[PDB]
Amino acid sequence: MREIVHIQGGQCGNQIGAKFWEVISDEHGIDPTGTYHGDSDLQLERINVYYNEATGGRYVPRAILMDLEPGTMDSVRAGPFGQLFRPDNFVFGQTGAGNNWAKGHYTEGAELIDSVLDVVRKEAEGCDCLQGFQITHSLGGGTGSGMGTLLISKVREEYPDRIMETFSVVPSPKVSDTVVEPYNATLSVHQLVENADECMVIDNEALYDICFRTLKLTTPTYGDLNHLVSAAMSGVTCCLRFPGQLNSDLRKLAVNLIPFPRLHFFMIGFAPLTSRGSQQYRALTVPELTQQMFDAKNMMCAADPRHGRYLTASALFRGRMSTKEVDEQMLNVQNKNSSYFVEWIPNNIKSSICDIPPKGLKMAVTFVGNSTAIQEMFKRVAEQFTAMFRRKAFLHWYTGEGMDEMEFTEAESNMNDLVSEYQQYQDATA
Amino acid sequence: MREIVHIQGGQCGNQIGAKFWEVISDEHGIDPTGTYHGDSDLQLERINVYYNEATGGRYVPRAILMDLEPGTMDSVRAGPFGQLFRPDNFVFGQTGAGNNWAKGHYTEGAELIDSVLDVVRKEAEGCDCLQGFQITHSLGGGTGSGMGTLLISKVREEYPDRIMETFSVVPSPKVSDTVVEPYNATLSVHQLVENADECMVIDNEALYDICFRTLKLTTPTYGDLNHLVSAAMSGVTCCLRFPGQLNSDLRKLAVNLIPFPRLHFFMIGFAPLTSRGSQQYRALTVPELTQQMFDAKNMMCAADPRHGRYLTASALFRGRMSTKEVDEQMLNVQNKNSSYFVEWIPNNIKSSICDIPPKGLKMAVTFVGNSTAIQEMFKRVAEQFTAMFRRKAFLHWYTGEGMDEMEFTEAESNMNDLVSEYQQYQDATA
Amino acid sequence: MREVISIHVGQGGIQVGNACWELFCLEHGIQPDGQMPSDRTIGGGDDAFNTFFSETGAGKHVPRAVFLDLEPTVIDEVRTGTYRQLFHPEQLISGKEDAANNFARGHYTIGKEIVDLCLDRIRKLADNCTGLQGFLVFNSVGGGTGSGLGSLLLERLSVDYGKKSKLGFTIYPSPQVSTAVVEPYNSILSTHSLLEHTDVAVMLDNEAIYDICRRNLDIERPTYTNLNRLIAQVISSLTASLRFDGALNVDITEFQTNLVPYPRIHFMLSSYAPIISAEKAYHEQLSVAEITNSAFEPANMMAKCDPRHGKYMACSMMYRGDVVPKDVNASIATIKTKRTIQFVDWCPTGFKVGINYQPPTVVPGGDLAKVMRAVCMISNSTAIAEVFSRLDHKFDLMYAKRAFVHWYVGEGMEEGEFSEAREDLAALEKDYEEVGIET
Amino acid sequence: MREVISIHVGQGGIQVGNACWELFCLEHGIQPDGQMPSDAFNTFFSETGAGKHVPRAVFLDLEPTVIDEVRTGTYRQLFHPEQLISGKEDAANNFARGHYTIGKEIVDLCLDRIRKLADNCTGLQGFLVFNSVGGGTGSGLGSLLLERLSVDYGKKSKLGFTIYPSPQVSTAVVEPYNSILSTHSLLEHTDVAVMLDNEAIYDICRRNLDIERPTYTNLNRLIAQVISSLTASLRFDGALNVDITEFQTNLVPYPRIHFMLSSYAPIISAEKAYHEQLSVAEITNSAFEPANMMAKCDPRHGKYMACSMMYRGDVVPKDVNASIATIKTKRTIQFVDWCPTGFKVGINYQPPTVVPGGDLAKVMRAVCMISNSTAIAEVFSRLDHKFDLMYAKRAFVHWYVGEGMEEGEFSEAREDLAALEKDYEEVGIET
Amino acid sequence: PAVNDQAAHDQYVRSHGNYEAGEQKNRNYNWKVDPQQHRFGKTDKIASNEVV
Ligand SMILES: Nc1nc2c(ncn2[C@@H]2O[C@H](COP(=O)(O)OP(=O)(O)OP(=O)(O)O)[C@@H](O)[C@H]2O)c(=O)[nH]1
Ligand SMILES: Nc1nc2c(ncn2[C@@H]2O[C@H](COP(=O)(O)OP(=O)(O)OP(=O)(O)O)[C@@H](O)[C@H]2O)c(=O)[nH]1
Ligand SMILES: Nc1nc2c(ncn2[C@@H]2O[C@H](COP(=O)(O)OP(=O)(O)O)[C@@H](O)[C@H]2O)c(=O)[nH]1
Ligand SMILES: Nc1nc2c(ncn2[C@@H]2O[C@H](COP(=O)(O)OP(=O)(O)O)[C@@H](O)[C@H]2O)c(=O)[nH]1
Numbered sequence A, B: 001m002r003e004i005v006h007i008q009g010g011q012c013g014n015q016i017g018a019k020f021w022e023v024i025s026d027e028h029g030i031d032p033t034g035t036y037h038g039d040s041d042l043q044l045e046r047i048n049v050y051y052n053e054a055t056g057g058r059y060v061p062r063a064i065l066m067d068l069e070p071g072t073m074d075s076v077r078a079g080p081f082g083q084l085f086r087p088d089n090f091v092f093g094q095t096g097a098g099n100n101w102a103k104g105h106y107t108e109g110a111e112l113i114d115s116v117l118d119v120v121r122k123e124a125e126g127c128d129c130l131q132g133f134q135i136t137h138s139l140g141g142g143t144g145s146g147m148g149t150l151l152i153s154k155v156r157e158e159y160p161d162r163i164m165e166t167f168s169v170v171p172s173p174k175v176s177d178t179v180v181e182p183y184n185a186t187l188s189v190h191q192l193v194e195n196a197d198e199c200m201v202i203d204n205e206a207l208y209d210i211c212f213r214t215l216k217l218t219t220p221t222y223g224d225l226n227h228l229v230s231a232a233m234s235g236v237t238c239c240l241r242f243p244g245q246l247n248s249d250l251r252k253l254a255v256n257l258i259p260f261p262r263l264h265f266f267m268i269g270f271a272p273l274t275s276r277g278s279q280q281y282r283a284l285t286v287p288e289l290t291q292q293m294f295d296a297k298n299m300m301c302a303a304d305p306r307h308g309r310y311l312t313a314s315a316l317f318r319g320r321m322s323t324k325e326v327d328e329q330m331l332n333v334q335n336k337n338s339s340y341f342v343e344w345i346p347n348n349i350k351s352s353i354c355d356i357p358p359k360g361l362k363m364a365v366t367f368v369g370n371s372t373a374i375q376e377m378f379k380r381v382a383e384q385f386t387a388m389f390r391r392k393a394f395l396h397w398y399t400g401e402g403m404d405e406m407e408f409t410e411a412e413s414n415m416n417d418l419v420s421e422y423q424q425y426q427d428a429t430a
Numbered sequence C: 001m002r003e004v005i006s007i008h009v010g011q012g013g014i015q016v017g018n019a020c021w022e023l024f025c026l027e028h029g030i031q032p033d034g035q036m037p038s039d040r041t042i043g044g045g046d047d048a049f050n051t052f053f054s055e056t057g058a059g060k061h062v063p064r065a066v067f068l069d070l071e072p073t074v075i076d077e078v079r080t081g082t083y084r085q086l087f088h089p090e091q092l093i094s095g096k097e098d099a100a101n102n103f104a105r106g107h108y109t110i111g112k113e114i115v116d117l118c119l120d121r122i123r124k125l126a127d128n129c130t131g132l133q134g135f136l137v138f139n140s141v142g143g144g145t146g147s148g149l150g151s152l153l154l155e156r157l158s159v160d161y162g163k164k165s166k167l168g169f170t171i172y173p174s175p176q177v178s179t180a181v182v183e184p185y186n187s188i189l190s191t192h193s194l195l196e197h198t199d200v201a202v203m204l205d206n207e208a209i210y211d212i213c214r215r216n217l218d219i220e221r222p223t224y225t226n227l228n229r230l231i232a233q234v235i236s237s238l239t240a241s242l243r244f245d246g247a248l249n250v251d252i253t254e255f256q257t258n259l260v261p262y263p264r265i266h267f268m269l270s271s272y273a274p275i276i277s278a279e280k281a282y283h284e285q286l287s288v289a290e291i292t293n294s295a296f297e298p299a300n301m302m303a304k305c306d307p308r309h310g311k312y313m314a315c316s317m318m319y320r321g322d323v324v325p326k327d328v329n330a331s332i333a334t335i336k337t338k339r340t341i342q343f344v345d346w347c348p349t350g351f352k353v354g355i356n357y358q359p360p361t362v363v364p365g366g367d368l369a370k371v372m373r374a375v376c377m378i379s380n381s382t383a384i385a386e387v388f389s390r391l392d393h394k395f396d397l398m399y400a401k402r403a404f405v406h407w408y409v410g411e412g413m414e415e416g417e418f419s420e421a422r423e424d425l426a427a428l429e430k431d432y433e434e435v436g437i438e439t
Numbered sequence D: 001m002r003e004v005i006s007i008h009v010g011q012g013g014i015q016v017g018n019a020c021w022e023l024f025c026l027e028h029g030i031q032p033d034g035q036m037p038s039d040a041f042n043t044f045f046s047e048t049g050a051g052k053h054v055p056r057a058v059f060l061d062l063e064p065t066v067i068d069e070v071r072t073g074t075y076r077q078l079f080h081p082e083q084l085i086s087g088k089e090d091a092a093n094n095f096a097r098g099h100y101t102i103g104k105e106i107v108d109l110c111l112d113r114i115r116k117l118a119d120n121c122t123g124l125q126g127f128l129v130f131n132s133v134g135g136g137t138g139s140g141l142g143s144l145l146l147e148r149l150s151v152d153y154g155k156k157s158k159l160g161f162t163i164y165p166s167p168q169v170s171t172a173v174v175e176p177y178n179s180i181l182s183t184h185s186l187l188e189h190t191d192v193a194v195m196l197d198n199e200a201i202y203d204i205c206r207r208n209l210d211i212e213r214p215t216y217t218n219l220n221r222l223i224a225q226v227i228s229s230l231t232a233s234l235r236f237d238g239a240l241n242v243d244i245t246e247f248q249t250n251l252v253p254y255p256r257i258h259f260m261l262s263s264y265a266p267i268i269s270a271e272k273a274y275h276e277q278l279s280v281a282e283i284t285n286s287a288f289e290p291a292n293m294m295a296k297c298d299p300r301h302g303k304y305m306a307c308s309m310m311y312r313g314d315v316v317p318k319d320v321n322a323s324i325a326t327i328k329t330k331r332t333i334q335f336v337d338w339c340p341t342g343f344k345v346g347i348n349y350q351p352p353t354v355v356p357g358g359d360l361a362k363v364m365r366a367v368c369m370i371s372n373s374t375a376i377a378e379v380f381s382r383l384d385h386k387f388d389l390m391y392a393k394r395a396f397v398h399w400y401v402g403e404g405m406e407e408g409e410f411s412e413a414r415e416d417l418a419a420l421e422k423d424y425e426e427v428g429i430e431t
Numbered sequence E: 001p002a003v004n005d006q007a008a009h010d011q012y013v014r015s016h017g018n019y020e021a022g023e024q025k026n027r028n029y030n031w032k033v034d035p036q037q038h039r040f041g042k043t044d045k046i047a048s049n050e051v052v
């Protein structure tokens, strides 16, 4: 019961998803051929959440892969774990969005979604009791941000009471691969705040720093960055698939983290992370995990958490540990840093404990925090947008496919409205 | 409990620490791989004073290695006992100071000191009940004398109530290896007198004198001087680490040695020390130990202790010995040398006994003395400084990095003020 | 002949219930599978277990309890454990969607589809019983389904049975350490329902139990398993007079006639002594005089409340072991001579003492050391006004700007019940301050 | 049914209580484990019902070094594990640290434990407290403990076995500072005080036991023997029994003058203790010998007020009386005019016990003498001189000031010592 | 995993005093009685009916 479905779109989303399924299958003991090879009963206890059951006893993930070109979806099938997914769930076009949000949301993306909504509707209908959706996509691309945000709107219309997760990779100025990133990123934020219940933002800038310094490996690639995100993604739903002292599903996280409906943008991080040469000098204890958890350099976002005030924060502990240690550590950090925690809400940290740690680790921690420091990212993105739009540069592509400059101004006002509304509580006092 | 964290900076500081940690490891029975191999049960009871936690049945020191150039630490990491230290604690720049106090304290010191302060904060938060800090550095160099004292200032700012030790190797005019020594020396003394709680001055000339005359060894090197310094440093906290008839931690020494707040510069010495050829002819007894302890040539400074009067003195005895003998020998010395002990402080000698002798000896003593005879060390430094400062020689290097004549004039004024206020008590009587 | 029915709702109540049912089976010699050991099947002729269990007609015994929760993880975990064969299969009611710390979810949306099934189970259990004394309900207040379903059950049971006594062993949030962030909201809402529908309430916060384990049991890293073992001993001690012969027996109905002066005032906090480990248990005598003095020690209060800040009203303290009626009288009279412990003026005599012969039992492989004597205390004092006042302050800070409200309004909750719940806590405060005033 | 609680605070108190308790356990026949291999013990030990016993003592310190020795030595089994109170940071010879900074965070638990012990006790005679005056925590916590006990229990007798600094031999350097403050604290809070400075015991050891290199272990054995001889009347049958309360009946003429110094005899090494009969007349003169005083003080420099001597062994009452007449007839030993009868005697039938590995030789007769005399003013005068020389230019004052002590406390203690010396001088004159 | 066994866990417990979840403190006594058994208390000797 209370199972969830997975949808991934674009190149960035597909690469994130292709590694997330690798991580999950390892925990539950599923080989790439879909045959169980585990050792404990708890691995097969709650497999209904992420997997379907087919004749012959093979498990298949309930995931939908969407894109507008077969370039990336041909590689994912030709590589490892390509036989895990159902061949009929692969849906894709033939042209490609061409890094144009208007093309991926108005002209070409709207034409394709008739097919993909059918398989999603079929998947969400055959389940016993749906819990929610989760989306992986990038806000800096055409098909990822274009079709991805449109798919959220229509699914929301059919499932008003279900919850939605989005693991979004927003583009930072320091690492830029497209020249029209500020345009389509801003347009994606407009529709995202309206429909998505929970939004987690990821930065390629921050992931590089973590891999450069904490893991101390000189040559990262997109393979390693996708793995860092994958570990956190499985951590959020860890307590949904394993027993624990304190149980908290996705809905419980939403209630305890969102004070007001429009403020649902979070930052995430993982612990422990140690280099190969320094892994035998560390001792795995709760007091040392909480130090790396709250480290400002460990967050997966370019925003500095010490530049604002934490509205609320959550920690998901995995492994064997005592609740007295966990509870007393979350109290101390709040008292020592009362300046960085907003003061009209007492004890704004929620703790959950799961009894099964990840693969090969005695203990692990996933941190999800809602802080006012996230405003800086939108401010610097909007600054790039207003310089480009004041000259109407590259705007003949969007105006040439049915959308007008009225929408561009309207979207900018809402995004600027969010920051002003979000920063209000940073200086608000009781 | 009542544990201390160690910080070593500069070439001289790193060389001192590389020997001090070897001595401590040999005393506590720690192999070069960091695994306990002791024989007696007492050797493990108080190991948390100096060593941290690690998985695998091993222990790791709580020391931080800091320098602006990677030359010396890359050498010590490949040497003996070099695998104990955590690679995370190794912090280095890429430029170096080049014997410039301004460069190592204003331009490059501020840029790098953030990481060392962060790691020190990590260690201090981790440790159970901090007792204090101890530093090993040389005052005649650029990176050491500047960045170490900047660290002293910041650590005193953050922990105003903890204790602090510094072991300064000040430049001596008899053996000079640098033409710009007086400037940074007086600049560092000006900062250190305000912040340090316990400072213990060492001279290379005195060490060479000792190894040439008492040890009677033909060719001393930096190894033997470092060994003497390490033994003297370990003797201070021997009674803190091990049980004894009278236990006395660092705090008990300060309140018994410092009469007035700005008189906290001591000179130290060790006994017994004998040549290899005369080892089997000598008799190791308490009177001989205290005789060599009060021998003038045994001090580790160029200052003659017979040119001034002792304010207070403290001796830390090691081994099993009768308490009456120690007291009667102290009284006998203080009575037979009543001219060299200032009158208005009756019974100005302190004694402590620890029942665990050093590895190699049956009896050993560490002497610490606060004598009005330390001023000649400051007097000779100031004479060179004013001679070089009258003509403004070599001053453009310092004044081109944010410094000017004002702080030089201020420091020389503070330098003479300490000398005058420190000599006044030599002539002050009851 | 005499029965009591225990109701467990919410994760907090269920996990406490698991510890309690481990102790009851061991106290009566029943194996986890429900069958008595083969060596002494016919040995246990006396039916002292009839208070909690019921004979199946041929062989095993079934507990008189039902398990309730909307989330399936905790319940189905029991069904896969070694206790799968003890409980009746269809009295472990399970849902599909959790309340998710939302009181409106567990009282209007999901809670109304499960309360129907439970009352059917309770009806069948009650008809088997013939001398029913009362109900025992365990639920954590600071939770969604714990406060939601518990409110619905007590309201439903109050009209379905009427005069039957009900006891609530609730767990209120700690003064400073907490798990959730919005529990001050639904704690007040829970307080509204149990005020007029529960005869006796017990304060069992978590901070006090943490300190007891750290100080007396000498456990530096306690967990929830250790906490629930201590609570089980309190439940066993209170009901020990219903199933064991003693000098002074006490019934379940022999609480509200002696501990409730006024109908509104029925909240109380518990205390237990001695709590000691085997390493230092045999250094001291554990005499009657010193075990009863530790009961009044503020550090052994099971709730983080300071009795020195208020007056005592009534104390029901139960002795089990080899205590002598002469010994307790001398110990009690000594207390009255003490000046720090001050009772209210209009209560000249304020001690209800019970004596039992069965010494307390300890689970093998556990923490505690078995001792000849133990005393459990239930005290009604005016000092409990602090725990409600600090909850009132926490709620007023967040509700002043309508924080987290939209999660409740959208689940069938009207805006106005937040205000009216606040007033009743304020009304409760005035009752406590006006009852301890000097006349 | 008569009991007495002993409090050991500071390193000196702990290291003398170790010897006291090994001696008591050996004397009563209880193994270090606390078990008795198959009623007089009831004064010091409490039965747990099945097997072992527990001493009526509590250990205090802020430095965990000495306590960890007890919890790991051969006596780990004897003591209750939560009455070995241990701190984390030592006072480090700073009196204000042990009275104003960290003494207020540990004294509460000590009072709790003492209350628990006193509730168990039923015939509490009084308190024994052992401390080192010339130290930080010893003078600090001891002061706080006496201040709290004096209001908590009231009229219960408290006896302080303090150890003042020696005239010329001492270890610390700020030690004269905090001895005066502790003197103020204990003057109005201790009913009977005994002086047990170190230098006098060193002389006794060298002169009698013929050991040239004694240590603290040898010294603490003598103090334990003195304590056992003092308290043996509470737990053994004798011809004349003296309680604790018959010391606050016979030795303190005026409420202020309650300081005294002790003596013990015979103390002879075994190599020469058997060539002499050591009759009662010999031991009674060795006790009055000025060189045999346990405090570095000269009794010939003042009068005598009261003298209590405890005989244990096979003594005969008439033999004691003849010794009293001989002492009175001697001209060097003179008593004050307003005290015609000046001796209180006690006789006990239990011979002294011998600890294996010790230096003392077992003898049939032994006398412990407690004397109140005007000669004790000289130690106060010499510590006053040392303090005045120290305080002339305000040395080491900032260390105490930066811990919460007001400036005028030193002056108040100084005038207190002046008043005490004036009281001794005015009471020493004739009528 | 590179995890420490019991022979290192006990050493670290003795060294730094870090404990597992809900682990008692073992002071390593020497018992004549069995700690698992025995009721750990002093009982006053109770006689039979003396009033007769
Ligand atoms: N003493 C004790 N308290 C517990 C335990 N488990 C949970 N709690 C308390 O219960 C509160 C939250 O409610 P939970 O028990 O976790 O869950 P619930 O009451 O069933 O409500 P839901 O979360 O909606 O399912 C926490 O703040 C804890 O204080 C436990 O095992 N022992
Ligand atoms: N007779 C005797 N005296 C001792 C012994 N140990 C210490 N002292 C006395 O104690 C004095 C110093 O104070 P300490 O007891 O050592 O230290 P403290 O009182 O515990 O105060 P802190 O050092 O701050 O803990 C010395 O002058 C000694 O005379 C001992 O073993 N036997
Ligand atoms: N983490 C991660 N980021 C990626 C990967 N591939 C591309 N990106 C980022 O995504 C941005 C471009 O998005 P894109 O893939 O073109 O979106 P799409 O056109 O909708 O598929 C670039 O700035 C990259 O930094 C990947 O494999 N992993
Ligand atoms: N005792 C000792 N002194 C040293 C050693 N190495 C260098 N020195 C002294 O340190 C002085 C040079 O200081 P330096 O290392 O350049 O200071 P820095 O520039 O701040 O690192 C020389 O005068 C040496 O006498 C050593 O191994 N042992």
Ligand SMILES: [Mg+2]
Pocket: A247, C010, C011, C071, C098
């Ligand atoms: Mg639950």
Ligand SMILES: [Mg+2]
Pocket: B247, D010, D011, D063, D090, D135, D137
């Ligand atoms: Mg001490």
